[PDB]
Amino acid sequence: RKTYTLTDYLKNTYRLKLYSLRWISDHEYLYKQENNILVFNAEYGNSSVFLENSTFDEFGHSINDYSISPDGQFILLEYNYVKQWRHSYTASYDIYDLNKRQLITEERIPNNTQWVTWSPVGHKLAYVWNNDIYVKIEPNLPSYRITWTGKEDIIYNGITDWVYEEEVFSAYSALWWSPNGTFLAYAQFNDTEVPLIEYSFYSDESLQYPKTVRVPYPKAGAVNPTVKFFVVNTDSLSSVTNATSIQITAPASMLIGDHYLCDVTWATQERISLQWLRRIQNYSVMDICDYDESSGRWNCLVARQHIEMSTTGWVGRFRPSEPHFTLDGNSFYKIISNEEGYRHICYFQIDKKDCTFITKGTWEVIGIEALTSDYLYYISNEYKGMPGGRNLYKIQLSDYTKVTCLSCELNPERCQYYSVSFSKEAKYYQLRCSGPGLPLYTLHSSVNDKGLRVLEDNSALDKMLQNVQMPSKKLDFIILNETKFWYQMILPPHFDKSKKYPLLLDVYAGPCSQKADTVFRLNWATYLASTENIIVASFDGRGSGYQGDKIMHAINRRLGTFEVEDQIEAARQFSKMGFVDNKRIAIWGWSYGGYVTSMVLGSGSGVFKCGIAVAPVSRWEYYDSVYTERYMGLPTPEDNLDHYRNSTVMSRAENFKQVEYLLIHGTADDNVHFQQSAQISKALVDVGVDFQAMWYTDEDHGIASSTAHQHIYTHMSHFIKQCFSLP
Amino acid sequence: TECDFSPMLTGVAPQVYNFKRLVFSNCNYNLTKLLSLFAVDEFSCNGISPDSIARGCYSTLTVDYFAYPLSMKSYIRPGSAGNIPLYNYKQSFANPTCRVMASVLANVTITKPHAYGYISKCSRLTGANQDVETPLYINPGEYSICRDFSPGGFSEDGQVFKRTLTQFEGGGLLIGVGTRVPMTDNLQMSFIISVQYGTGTDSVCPML
Ligand SMILES: *[C@@H]1O[C@H](CO)[C@@H](O[C@@H]2O[C@H](CO)[C@@H](O[C@@H]3O[C@H](CO)[C@@H](O)[C@H](O)[C@@H]3O)[C@H](O)[C@H]2NC(C)=O)[C@H](O)[C@H]1NC(C)=O
Ligand SMILES: *[C@@H]1O[C@H](CO)[C@@H](O[C@@H]2O[C@H](CO)[C@@H](O)[C@H](O)[C@H]2NC(C)=O)[C@H](O)[C@H]1NC(C)=O
Ligand SMILES: *[C@@H]1O[C@H](CO)[C@@H](O[C@@H]2O[C@H](CO)[C@@H](O)[C@H](O)[C@H]2NC(C)=O)[C@H](O)[C@H]1NC(C)=O
Ligand SMILES: *[C@@H]1O[C@H](CO)[C@@H](O[C@@H]2O[C@H](CO)[C@@H](O)[C@H](O)[C@H]2NC(C)=O)[C@H](O)[C@H]1NC(C)=O
Ligand SMILES: *[C@@H]1O[C@H](CO)[C@@H](O)[C@H](O)[C@H]1NC(C)=O
Ligand SMILES: *[C@@H]1O[C@H](CO)[C@@H](O)[C@H](O)[C@H]1NC(C)=O
Ligand SMILES: *[C@@H]1O[C@H](CO)[C@@H](O)[C@H](O)[C@H]1NC(C)=O
């Protein structure tokens, strides 16, 4: 039969099918079938055409995306999309009436809009343009200007600056509508004293002089952005006087120094929760704020404060978890770490300090998915004690001993990794299985957990793949000091454990990472195992997540140590297994994986022949403050400068004489700056080490443009094949 | 001799939390005259009528005055509290009072402040993790402990202030926030008039 080739991977010849739906009510959802927008009925499965695909091929532009108002009356049309960072972009927008079937032409959302969002009910619009917030009560009426302080690279209203987009909210948007759309809450970010990273962008051949890109970007220990939080009443807006925003100040425990706004969650129509986080991120507070028309302010009662801090590391996995409020808003459920260091659901009263865990065990809750008056729905890795598994559970609120697994036994062979999408009021839910078999999408009704139908079973792909010698995947664990540590291996087809195979260690290994799971993937490793008979292993050592704080917080204040050592040790045990050629063990990684790869290669352990680092961190003082300081604290003599200096890649330059190294970086990387690899090469040059290198002009951290993506994997494949003496 | 309501219209109008007070004794006043310089929006009295206030004989006539936007009219009213009566100015009702909400007229010649400003946070901080927060509130007629931070106003909306409290003041940290309300076309003010009826020989009657 055939094998899964590099061309198959680069040309996407074996496609995974998806089933992306948008719930619009408690029983209906939108879905795109052959470019039409269809509205489906959850209970019956019938569908009408919501929007005929021919509706806008007379529009004059290409639609990048669309957004339908909650009441169904209007569709927001996105075109002229221009990507900025990981989540940010600008676009032109047209609104289109769905009963009159006509394009609104008056009082239009301007070109180069930074963000747009419908109110959660009805059809109000809030958008951000030139760093200021505007509100349209009706699609054809004029806009009310909420903010006037907006200013490029300095003041951000309703949108995030670079570091808040990347490391805090994972979003460009900093707008939070109240549940019924009365209030619009928004953050204001201030980058006034934040230093700028600068780098060249070469652009098209026709550009004579390169551009210099300048982004406000706080590297470790540098001056951070500041933040203020506001709420505006969108129902009492005046076309004659300037809008009034009420400021919700951070609690005084935060104002004494540097801090972040790290969570925003509306509790009720007149109650908002905010979570703040000190710049030393082992201390956070939640504030609960009620609207008070009488006194014209948002009162945040001190007695309603909830302090969350950590004694072994930082708070949350990457940030304090979001609360899920009961309907009346007087109590809420929140994932927090227990006394054993495991993360479970805790039950809070808004005015009571102590909380009550409703789950426990040596496993973890991944996320709270839905809340009804009777049941709390969550995802966890409890099943068979596999940290790399995900299942849907519901727990009865009247009796915490009644826990039901809703996904475990549906198809235990094919499906061990689940996510879920609930309808409104959680009357229906879609289940999405990602492995270890081909992905499978089903729909269920909540009232009696009945399976209604299969939405997508990837049977097309299944038929295609049987003519192909596909690799298999082994998920298991080894033991280090009476502790289970999980690994996975992508094994070549017809795997003969009496043969010796070369091994490529696929590493990431950042804090709370997980590279050993049950997820089905069709990627580069698939080609390496299927065509080149390479074993591709990954290993979750110390610092990895979803296994309790004792593992995760192990690398606290000491990045570049245990997580690095544990990758070397795992490779040693792999080479002892008998089917691994120990003269041909390589290692490769991206971003944090690039750092670990490099640190491993420079350790002089002798275990690895060659390695590839793509866009690596090389020195933690080079990386942004929020991510870095979360794990390392501040780079000062009073804090943690010693570990900052001892954990660079440049420090280990001498040891690279023992290995073949390939260093790759995009020149337009706004995330892990080219500087980082630039310093690695300089240190290797200064010490006489030969190595391979590759820059990618105007590529960012993803190196994901069509041509660049194909080029780097083609290049890396040559490198691996040559290193492994494959012809 | 005549009552001198001059100082409350010369110089720069003080902010609400930094109110200035004129106390008159043995002095004859024209209230109608003083009120003529303003466009009055609210005239709420307590323990006395807006007619009697301009015609009565008093032992003392006290006026607290400050800049204040009329958009915040409702937030300085009794019992409805309130960033203003908590941290800035709390009206006393121990004596007959009158609260006047007014805009100064166009060709009066006042030099107004850059903006209106009030304190919207004032707390003491103690504890090992610096997190026992105790909001500090004023008694009527007294100045906030957070007033000294920036008596002239706030150049920034949501401006933060920090200070160590002396052993005497109770120790710990003092935290204050001030908010900024943009200045209006015509200066908007507020003055609180208070009278007493003392037995002593000396009065403040109106002018004949
Ligand atoms: C965004 O943050 C910047 C940087 O923190 C803010 O700029 C600063 O605002 C202060 C106001 O507190 C300016 O003032 C100084 O205050 C002291 C008196 O306490 C005095 O010594 C100085 O004469 C001056 O008045 C400061 O110059 C200014 N710094 C700048 C502009 O670089 C800015 O206010 C913030 N903007 C927003 C919208 O939050
Ligand atoms: C799905 O089917 C239901 C019927 O099973 C549709 O509801 C009916 O629609 C017809 C025609 O519009 C009406 O005359 C009936 O009165 C409706 N009956 C009920 C019980 O609703 C429904 O509109 C369909 N939905 C979609 C999205 O196709
Ligand atoms: C709403 O606020 C804006 C911004 O403060 C006002 O516009 C400014 O007015 C000042 C007055 O000197 C000018 O210097 C600025 O150039 C104006 N524009 C901007 C963008 O700041 C506006 O007048 C206010 N509107 C109302 C109705 O009061
Ligand atoms: C958050 O972490 C910091 C840094 O580890 C803690 O501050 C240090 O605590 C140790 C022992 O508690 C002291 O010996 C150091 O002097 C402290 N400062 C530094 C710079 O290390 C802090 O205690 C932690 N906060 C909480 C609430 O646990
Ligand atoms: C529009 O939908 C019809 C439905 O049959 C389909 O045949 C056609 O190819 C679609 N057009 C585009 C451009 O997707
Ligand atoms: C966006 O730009 C185009 C081209 O300059 C222009 O024709 C169009 O009117 C603009 N749209 C708006 C809403 O200003
Ligand atoms: C939305 O909630 C606010 C605050 O409780 C309330 O005043 C308003 O009437 C509500 N509007 C609707 C349409 O329910």
Stated resolution in angstroms = 2.6
Q: Which residues of A touch B125 (CB under 8 A)?
A: 252-253, 256
Does an H or E element contain A501, and which? strand A501-507
Beta-carbon neighbour count of residue B200 at 10 Å? 9
* Residue A158 token pair: 């309703």
Same domain, A135 and A196: yes
CA distance B86 to A415: 60
Q: Last residue of some domain: A408, A436, A469? A: A469
Query: Cβ of A421: how many Cβ atoms within 10 Å?
Result: 19
Q: What are phi and psi of A111, to 5 degrees?
A: -60, 160
In A591-714, where do the E strands start and end? 610-614, 660-666, 692-696
**Please, how many CA atoms are within 13 Å of residue A269, restricted to the half-sphere of its CB?**
4
Residues of B in contact with A244 (CB under 8 A): 71
- Dist CA A659 CA A678 (whole Å): 19
Tell me if B129 and A309 make a contact (CB, 8 A cut-off).
yes
What one-character-per-residue DSSP string does A323-389 give? PEE-TTSSEEEEEEE-TTS-EEEEEEETT-S--EES--SSS-EEEEEEE-SSEEEEEES-GGG-TT-
CA distance A319 to chain B (A): 20
How would you write chain B as a 3-class SS string? CECCCCCCCCCCCCCHHHCEEEEECCCEECHHHHHCCEEEEEEEEECCCCCHHHCCCECEEEEEEEECCHHHHHHHCCCCCCHHHHHHCCCCCCCCEEEEEEEECCCCCCCCCCEEEEEEEEEEEECCCCCEEEECCCCCCCCCCCHHHCCCCCCCCCEEEEEECCCCCCCCEEEEEEEEEECCCCCEEEEEEEEECCCCCCCECECC
Residues A281 and A382 in one domain: yes
CATH code, domain with A261: 2.140.10.30
B167 burial (CB, 10 Å; 0-12 / 13-18 / 19+) is exposed
Which domains does chain B carry? 1-114+183-208 (3.30.70.1840), 115-182 (2.20.210.30)
Q: Quick one: which of A515, A516, A443 has its CA closest to A474?
A: A516
Q: Is B170 left (phi over 0), alpha (psi -120 to 50) or beta?
A: left
Contact A23, A370 (CB under 8 A): no
Let me know how many helices (H) and strands (E) chain A has, helices first: 12, 46
Give the other-Cβ count within 10 Å of A628's Cβ. 23
**Alpha carbon distance A603, A618 (integer Å):** 14
Q: Which ligand is nearest to the CA of A239?
A: 3
Q: Is A251 helix (H, G, I), strand (E, B) or coil?
A: coil
Which letter does DSSP use for residue A151 in this model? B
Phi then psi for residue A232, to 5 deg, are -120, 140
Domain membership of residue A564 as a residue range: 470-727
Domain tally, chain A: 2
The owner of tokens 């490029």 is A152
SS (H, E, C) A405-471: ECCCCCCCCCEEEEEEEECHHHCEEEEEEEEECCCEEEEEECCCCEEEEEEECCHHHHHHHCCEECC
Domain co-membership, A284 together with A266: yes
Q: Are residue A507 and residue A391 in the same domain, yes or no?
A: no
Give the Cα separation of A161 and A88 in Å (integer): 10
Residue B130's φ and ψ, nearest 5 degrees, are 45, 65
**How many Å apart are CA B194 and CA B171, to the nearest integer?**
36
Which protein residue's CA is at the shortest distance from atom 1 of ligand 6?
A111
Max Cα distance, chain A (Å): 82
Of B80, B121, B177, the CB nearest to A295: B80
How many Cβ pairs closer than 8 A exist between chain A and B?
55
| A90, A92, A113, A140: residue to mutate for ligand 6 pocket, most atoms within 8 A of CB | A92
- Relative to beta strand A2-3, strand A468-469 is parallel
* Binding-site residues on chain A for chain B (CB distance < 8 A): 228, 242, 244, 247, 249, 251-253, 255-256, 283, 285, 294-297, 302, 305, 307, 309
Q: Do A309 and B123 touch (CB under 8 A)?
A: no
Q: Residue A405's CB: how many other CB atoms inside 10 A?
A: 14
Determine the atom of ligand 6 nearest the C-alpha atom of A109. Answer: 13
| H or E, element range at A580 | strand A580-590
Please answer whether residues A70 and A118 qualify as being in contact, where contact means their C-beta atoms are separated by less than 8 angstroms.
yes
- CA angle, A680 as apex, A677 and A684 as ends, to 5°? 140
CB within 8 Å: A252 and B81: no
Q: Do A482 and A351 share a structural domain? A: no
The answer to whether A478 and A573 have CB atoms below 8 angstroms apart is: yes
B9 burial level (CB within 10 Å; 0-12, 13-18, 19+): middle
Nearest chain B residue to A244 by CA distance is: B181
Phi-psi bin for A499: left (phi > 0), alpha (psi -120 to 50), beta? beta
Q: Which of A589, A593, A591, A588 is nearest to A611 (CA)?
A: A588
Taking the alpha carbons at both ends of chain A, their separation in whole angstroms is 20
Residues A416 and A490 in one domain: no
CA angle A612, A615, A616 (to 5 degrees): 75
Closest CA to A3 of A625, A643, A530, A668: A530
Experimental method, per PDB record = X-ray
Task: Measure the CA–CA gap between A520 and A473, rounded to whole angstroms.
Answer: 9
Tokens of A603: 């350790």
Q: How many residues does chain A have?
A: 727
* Alpha carbons A256 and B106: distance in angstroms, whole number: 43
CA distance B70 to B78: 16
Q: What is the biggest distance separating any 2 CA atoms in chain B, rounded to whole angstroms?
A: 66
A441 shares its domain with A478 = no
Q: Which pair of tokens denotes residue A457?
A: 């079973």
Determine contact, residues A544/A514, Cβ cutoff 8 Å. yes
Question: Integer distance in angstroms from the first to the last C-alpha of chain B?
Answer: 12
- By Cβ distance, the residue of B80, B162, B179 closest to A247 is B179
- Long-range contacts for B127-131 (Cβ within 8 Å, ≥24 apart)? B129/A253, B129/A283, B129/A309, B130/A253, B130/A256, B130/B173, B131/A251, B131/A253, B131/A285, B131/A307
CB atoms under 10 Å from CB of A93, counted, come to 19
Residue A259, number of CB atoms within 10 A of its CB: 23
Own/partner pairs, A464-468, CB within 8 angstroms, 24+ separation = A464/A14, A465/A14, A467/A1, A467/A2, A468/A1, A468/A2, A468/A3, A468/A4, A468/A14, A468/A530
Torsion sign over Cα A669, A671, A672, A674: positive
Q: Is the Cα torsion angle A42, A47, A48, A54 positive or negative in sign?
A: positive
Please provide the DSSP assignment of A212-232 as one string: EEEEE--BTTSPPPEEEEEEE
Question: Does one domain contain both A117 and A194?
Answer: yes
CB A384 within 8 A of CB A394: no
Which residue's CA lies nearest to atom 6 of ligand 5? A34
Q: What is the DSSP string of A38-57?
A: EEEETTT--EEEEE-GGGGT
A229 forms beta bridges with: A187
Return the residue in B68, B71, B75, B121 with the most chain A beta carbons within 10 A, the one to mutate for interface testing.
B121
Which residues, 6+ apart, have CB-to-CB distance to A532 below 8 Å? A720, A721, A724, A726
Cβ proximity of A503 and A534 under 8 Å: yes
- Whether residue A407 contacts residue A425, with contact meaning beta carbons closer than 8 Å, is answered with no
> Which regions of A72-182 does DSSP assign to beta strands (E)?
74-83, 89-97, 102-103, 113-118, 125-129, 132-136, 144-145, 155-157, 175-177
Do A426 and A370 contact (CB within 8 A), yes or no? Answer: yes
Question: A428-436 and A415-422: which strand pairing?
Answer: antiparallel
Evaluate whether A430 touches A442 at the Cβ level (below 8 Å). yes
Distances (CA, A) of A489 to A503, A721, B96, B123: 9, 19, 86, 58
Which of A131, A192, A229 is the best mutation target for the ligand 1 pocket, counting ligand atoms within 8 Å of the beta carbon and taking the most?
A: A192
Q: Please tell me the distance from the alpha carbon of residue A211 to that of residue A199, in angstroms, as a whole number.
A: 8
Domain boundary among the residues A433, A449, A469 is at: A469
Please classify residue A482 by burial: count the beta carbons closer than 10 Å to its beta carbon, then call 0-12 exposed, 13-18 middle and 19+ buried.
exposed
What's the A349 CA to ligand 3 centre distance in angstroms? 45
Residues A487 and A465 in one domain: no
**Residues of chain B in Cβ contact (below 8 Å) with chain A:** 71-72, 74-75, 80-83, 120-121, 123, 125, 129-131, 133, 135, 157-158, 160, 162, 173, 175, 177, 179, 182
Domain stops at, among A452, A469, A486: A469
The secondary structure element, H or E, covering residue A237 is none
Residue A129 makes CB contacts below 8 A (sequence gap 6+) with A109, A110, A112, A113, A114
Strand, helix or coil for residue A68 = strand
Quickly tell me which residue has 């280090």 as its tokens.
Answer: A480
Q: Report DSSP state, residue A564.
A: H
The DSSP secondary-structure symbol of A142 reads: P
Q: Are residues A537 and A400 in the same domain?
A: no
Q: Is B129 in the pocket of ligand 4 (CB under 6 A)?
A: yes
C-alpha span between A654 and A663 (Å, rounded): 16
Q: Residue A616 in contact with residue A591, Cβ under 8 Å? A: yes
Q: Which of A80, A111, A134 gets mutated to test ligand 6 (max ligand atoms within 8 A of its CB)? A: A111
Same-domain check for residues A463 and A491: no
Helix or strand or coil: residue A93? strand
Catalytic residues of A: 591, 669, 701
Main-chain dihedrals φ then ψ at residue B99, nearest 5 degrees? -105, 120
**Cβ–Cβ under 8 Å, residues A265 and A332:** no
**Is A421 in the same domain as A512?**
no
Tell which residue, A524, A532, A523, A416, has the closest CA to residue A475.
Answer: A416
In angstroms, the CA A625 to CA A623 distance is 7
Q: Which residues fall within 8 angstroms of residue A31, CB to CB, at 6 or more apart?
A: A19, A20, A21, A22, A37, A38, A39, A40, A47
Query: Which of B175, B180, B185 is the best residue to mutate to test the A interface, defined by the most A CB atoms within 10 Å of its own CB?
Result: B175
Residue A478's closest CA among A540, A426, A431, A420? A540
Q: What angle do CA A428, A434, A440 make, to 5 degrees?
A: 55
Helix (H, G, I), strand (E, B) or coil at A175: strand
Q: Does a cis peptide bond (omega within 30 degrees of 0) precede residue B82?
A: yes
> Using omega within 30 degrees of 0 as the cis cutoff, is the peptide bond preceding A210 cis?
no
